[PDB]
Amino acid sequence: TMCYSHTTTSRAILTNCGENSCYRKSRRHPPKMVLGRGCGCPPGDDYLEVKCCTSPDKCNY
């Protein structure tokens, strides 16, 4: 999958994760600010929410 790789989606740059998933990590509790995006699927906990998707491309918006 091609994934977004930054905390903002504005910039015209992506990461080609290949066979790996995209992730989007954010604060689980409001304000739910995005803390990072990239390849793989790191573990969440009470503070951090991590969504992981394998398609379509840029699914980690």
From Swiss-Prot:
Expressed by the venom gland. Coiled coil: none annotated. InterPro entries: Snake_3FTx, Snake_toxin-like_sf, Snake_toxin_con_site, Toxin_cobra-type. It comes from the Eukaryota. GO terms for cellular component: extracellular region. Pfam families: Toxin_cobra-type (PF21947). This is Fasciculin-1. It comes from Dendroaspis angusticeps (Eastern green mamba). The lineage of its organism: Eukaryota, Metazoa, Chordata, Craniata, Vertebrata.
